[PDB]
Structure formats: C-alpha cells, structure tokens
Design a protein around this nucleic acid. Sequence first.
RNA 1: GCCCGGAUGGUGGAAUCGGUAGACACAAGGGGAAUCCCUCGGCGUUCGCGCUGUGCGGGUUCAAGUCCCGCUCCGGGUACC
Length: 820
Amino acid sequence: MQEQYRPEEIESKVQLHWDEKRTFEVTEDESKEKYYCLSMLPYPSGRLHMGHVRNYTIGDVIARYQRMLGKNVLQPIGWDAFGLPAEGAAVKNNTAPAPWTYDNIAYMKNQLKMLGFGYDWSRELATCTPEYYRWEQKFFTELYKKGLVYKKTSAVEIPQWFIKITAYADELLNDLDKLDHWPDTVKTMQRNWIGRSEGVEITFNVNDYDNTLTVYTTRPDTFMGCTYLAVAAGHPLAQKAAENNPELAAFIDECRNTEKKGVDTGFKAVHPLTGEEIPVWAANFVLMEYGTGAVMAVPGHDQRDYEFASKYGLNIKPVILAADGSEPDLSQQALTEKGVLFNSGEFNGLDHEAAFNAIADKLTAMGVGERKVNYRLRDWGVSRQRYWGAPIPMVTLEDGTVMPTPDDQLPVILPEDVVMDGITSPIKADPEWAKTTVNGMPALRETDTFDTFMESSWYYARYTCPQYKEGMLDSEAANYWLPVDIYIGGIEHAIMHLLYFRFFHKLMRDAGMVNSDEPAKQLLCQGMVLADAFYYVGENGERNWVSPVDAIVERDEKGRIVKAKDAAGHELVYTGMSKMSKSKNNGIDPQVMVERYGADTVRLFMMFASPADMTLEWQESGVEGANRFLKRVWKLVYEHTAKGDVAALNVDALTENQKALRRDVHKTIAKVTDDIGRRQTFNTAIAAIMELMNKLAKAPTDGEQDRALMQEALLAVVRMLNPFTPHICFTLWQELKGEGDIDNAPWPVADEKAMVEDSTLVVVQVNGKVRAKITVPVDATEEQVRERAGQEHLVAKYLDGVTVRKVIYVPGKLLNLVVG
RNA sequence: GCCCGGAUGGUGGAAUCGGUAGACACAAGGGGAAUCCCUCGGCGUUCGCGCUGUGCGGGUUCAAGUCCCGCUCCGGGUACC
Ligand SMILES: [Mg+2]
Ligand SMILES: [Mg+2]
Ligand SMILES: [Mg+2]
C-alpha cells in the first residue's frame, strides 16, 4: 500500500476497471428486485457545469447504494442533442451543428467518466441520431391517426403542429394526487399551469348590435357589481365598432405589436339582472384565446377592473362585505376576498357559495348564462422553423391533402452535412429537399422540425431497450424497469419537461406500450449551487464582476470579509453567495476542481455541504476540508494494514471501552443507512462517518483485539463512504482484503448485539434545568437513579433545604426534580 | 399580487413522536509547505461550573429550536387565464 493518497494514480485505473468489467451494465433480471435511478440527461453544450456535477453525484450515490443493498440497479446516461445552441455555434464557428454536437458529446462523456459515475454505458443514447428519433416520428404518425394531432396557425403567427395535451388535462390533474413522493411545489406549479377553472358564461344583449356578447367569470357572486364589459382587441364586437371608429381601429392595430389600456367601443350592453345599460370596452388585458375573449368587469372586487375603472372614470360599485361584516373601504383598491353579498337585491346576505349558485341558477333559468369549466392549459405546439431537430413526418399531396409519411419512408433523416447561412434552415433553403413521392405522385414533405421537448419526453423509457428495433419500446423490458424509482433534476422544469413526460407516458400506456399510469415515483429537485460574487465600480460608473477565485479578501478578528481587491488593485464589493452565472462571473469549472483534488473530493464535498434539495454554497475551503478527510481515511487504513492480517474478533471478551467503540461503529452503520435510504440527508450521513473516523483515529491498535476491531470498523467505514467516494473506497477495500469488488459488496448491516448498552447517561434537571448528567447501569431502577442523582453535589446543591414536590422520570434518560 | 419555504454561533449546517441546543465541517487565532493533540455561542469562573442564549412578543407544559397565538424581517419561483 502506497503511503501517499494519490487521486491521479487511482481514479483513472478504477474507471478503466468499471469499463473493462462492465460493472454497471444490467439486464432485465426477473430474479432480482429492480431499481431505476434516473438523472435528467445533459444538453451537450461543451462542458459539465457545477449543476450537472451535483445532479449526477446525487444520482450516482443512490445508484451505488441501492446496488450494495442487493438491487438490480439501472442508471443510464445520454444526450439531449438537438436544439438551438448548436445552430448558434455552427454559425459562430465555421461548422455544422452535428459535428459540433458530437465533439461536445465525446468531451463531456470523458468528463462524466472522470467523475466515475457508474452508468450502464451500453444504454447510452444521443437523441439527434436517427436510431433514436425515428421512433418519435413513427409515434407521431400513430398519434395523428388516433386523432390527437392537428395543424393550425397561431401566435408564437405561423402554422404549427399541435398534440392534444388538453385531452389528458383531467388525468394530469387528478394523478397529481397519486404523487406523494413528488414535492408539493412542483405539484402546485402543474395544477396552476393546467388551471382548471369552474365558472359561468353570461350573455348580454347589445344595442345596435346583431349579436349577443358572452363573457366568462369565476366570480358570478360579484355580478350585481358589474358596471361595464371588456372585450379583447380581436373580438368580433370590437372589430364591428372599429369599422366606424378610427380611435378603436388604431387601438386594435396597436394590440398586436411590442399596463391597463383600452378604448370605449361605443356599444352598450343591458345588464340582464338590473336592466341598466353598461359600456363595452376593448381592453388590453383580455385574452381573445381564453374563455370567450370577454369579461364582465367588477371594479370593486377585481384588482385589474379596479385600475381600469379608475383610469377611465368608470363606476366602481361595492357588493362584497369585508371579512368582519363591514362594508369595504374601496378608496385605495378592490376587495378581493370572497364574502357575504350586499347591495345585490335578491342576493343580499348570501355567502360566497350560496351566491355563486343562486346567480348561476337565476341566469341559467333566464337563458342568459350557464356553468362552464375552462382550462388554462393550451394544446402542445411541437413545430419549429428550425434546422437542428428531428424532421416532422408529414407530407402534403398535390391535391392539398395532408397525411403522415408512409411507414416505408421512416425515419425521415435530417441531413447532417450542411452549411448554415444563419437565417434559413438548409432543408428549407434547398427547395429540392422537400420533394418526395407518395403512392407514386409528387408530394412535399414537411420542413419544420420537432420541438426538442419531443426527445426528452420519452428518453427515460427508451433507456430500457435502447437497441430494440421493431418498435419504440420493448414492453417487457420497459414494464420491468418502469416506473422510474427516483428522478433527480431541477425544479425549473416543473411545467415544461416534467409535465410533458407525464403526458407522453400516458400516451405510450394508451398505445399499449407500457402498463403504468405515471413515469416516476419520486422526483427529487436538487438545490442550486451558489458561489460568492464580487464587483468593483469602474471610473465610468460601470459594475465589473470579479470571479471569487480572483478576489483577495481581508477579514476581521472573527473572519468576516470587510475589504477585498482584485490583482489589478480595484476595490471589490462583496454581494454574498449568489447563483453561479456569466453575468456575475462567479462560475466555477468542475473540471478544474476534479483535476486539482480528484473526483472523490469533489463528489464528497458536494454531498457533504448541504442537503440535496437545499442550495449548496461552494467554498474552496470546504473542498480542501473534504480532501484532507480523505487523506485521514487513507492514512488510517495505511497504518492499519502495514501491520498485516488480523485475528478473528472475539466479541464476548471486549473491554467496556472496546464495546463502546464497537457500539459506535454499528450505531453509525444504522444511522448512515437510515439517512441515505429513508431520509435522504446525505450531509448528515457523511457527518456521522467523519464523526466515527475521528473516534477510530484515537483508538489503540497494538493488541490483537484492537486490531480486529479496527478491521471490522474500517471494512464498514470504507463501504459507507463508497457511494460518495468510490474510487478511493474501491482501492481501500482491496488493501483491507475485503472479498471481491466493493461495487458488489453488501451494504453493512448493524449488529444488534453490538448496539446493546451496559450503561445509560441520565440527564438530571432540577425544576427543568440541567444540573448533572450521570452514567448508571442500563437497567437501574427509578429509585436507584434518584439515589444517585441526590448523591451528586451538583444536584444536592439545589436540593439543600428545599422540598421535592414531585419528580418526572423518563426511564434511563431524564430525571427532573420539581422543587420546592 | 399568491404559493411555499425560511430566520439557531464569526460561516455552512445539526437536533428524526417536546427531554444534554449548536453534531459535522469551515473560518480564525494559537501550540507542536504538510501532519497530529488540542480551544472555540456570549458573560463570569475558584475549571467543578453559574448565568444567559434558537428573529421579537405571548401562551401551553415539570420541560419548547421543536406545539399554539401575534409581530418583524428575508430567499426563491410564479400571474392579466
Ligand atoms: Mg440536514
Ligand atoms: Mg443570525
Ligand atoms: Mg429533538
């Protein structure tokens, strides 16, 4: 065993071992319990950032841990390889998106391997390859045939392909209740995004107008407070008035281009319940695309109605009582909360629900209103006018008819060998490309490409069967691996990717491809990585941001930063810990830290510094701390093994001191197990390891028994660290002569006999304040404990000439003397 | 505007059915570039501890960081639906 811990001489060798033995390659083995650990796949931008490194270390800890529990563990990696940044970079260099993307993939793959992530590399997928994307093309034609796909022109105004995500709104919404191991925050974000709303449509007669106008409201209870209506710029009534009104027409034209603003339509509606004529405005805040593109306005109780009404001198009418039953102060703003009606005729005194229902019922029976459920969720627009994405498998015949690309022309291959002219997709600018023949007649194949969210919506599934032809999924394999047991990635994907992949899963279920409703049991959103951020003010008044690496700080007598400078001598202002970024120049390159300290130190720091789901504060000093710890583990194993083999441990003949150390070993095992497997607090797991290492470093190692005990502890410690720092642990395991490769060694289980106490610490309070802590035989009786407490000078001091009124006793733990 | 989080030493961050607050680590200063034995919330100390202490106020309980009421401050999403 080398005396010196040398990451550079260890890490690449173990890594090569992992590849040579294919250690982390798995099959669909029905005789084992499966566990699918998934991290969100990276975009091949060029290098890993610190967030990839946190995301994938978390995944790797879990995958290696679960393997040591004896599970069959799938941990796959791949590349979300289509998308915009490649087009930018293709043009910026003298190049094409594909070769730039493949270069980034090789470079980043080598970084992942240098970090020693235990992936099943045989399952590796890159989404820009025809072998991957042909399947989403095929599935898209199937989706179209199921009636879930349609073309339509829309804002972004351009034609687009949509997939009917609204056909699954209620399922996406209901099934959120099945997801207890998703965080509330992500669930609430998807709820609001889907935005199912229960309301009322209300129809008005309009003077000098040969239609009726209908609005949608979620607060029909406030309808007696309605003083005007507001319609979207692009509403048929708004257009009918503009015909004779240059002001209005001017306004409508504005509302397309680049904040309460509107115009008086000149039309008057009759309020169906008061008979009063009310104005109709065109207004900027009203979406033509939602509901009916028109609202009834109630300034007294809708904040945006309040602002609009004030601006244009429209009536503000109160109809909701305050929470305390008093008529609302509307001098400043609207009363938003739902309360009892007043000033609403027949509906006065009704509470919120009763009023909602009475007014709905009334307007229904009058035939000018009905209940109506709307959704904020729009259909999913999957089309882009972009080159670097998977072609959309549709064609147009000469007769005009749109249909899917015939099965025998799939995939539709994106040509990789192209030259970007910056502005037009090569497959657009060459009018030859589109030309095809369908049933031996000329057709034009679609020229738009898929939204990149298309590939990331089903990759997690394809990982189960990456080499399968015949179909998108081999069901047997997919149903074996799915659902994902834990999915680790950022909360920022909450209402894009994390919604799309639930939807796509349901689409694949409903094509018979899988047999479960939800793609992922647990979702873990890891916190952001923060770093210190500094800037100075140039003599031009411009803020110049200086990397915290480049900052020379100086500290008071307690270590607070109080003054700082860069090398050039500028005065820096410390702005605290902040999200890593190019704007603030506080990015840290993981590769530099891997090359400086070895991957194990980097990984250990990032798991130690902070619970997975909280923000992590990057500190060079914490990293050097982690590194020194690893040297202390290396040293203690060096010293222990330098003395050769050990006798078998005799557990019956241990000193009270030995029993105590061994109890601490096994309690640590229990605690680390609980922390990693149930609580998922990896920071406290690691702290328990360090704490134990500190004790082990202080224990004697001369006697045969001390050495046997040290062997047992080191074999446990080395396994406990292994999911965090597997390169050093793999090596140390061999030094200790552990059986086999550590990657397939069993996770240590705590020995119950080792955890038994002969003694217990009893905390002694007097009137609830700690006056002593006594060690007593583990089964001492309450009388024995009391007697011992009263023999303590520290306690007796507070019993002297005062009377014990009563005692509270928690067996073997606490005695409080109430006195007196 | 809501939706949660949160607030504990000089800093990060513990405390898992209320029962030894501050584990673990960093900074820092100090003793014997790298290493080990310490010390370390505050005040006081006869070194045994005493008082005080988890954002402020109050309640509950023999006992509150942890439960309940009310403040004050703060981070991060996110809206004309
Ligand atoms: Mg924690
Ligand atoms: Mg504080
Ligand atoms: Mg506790």
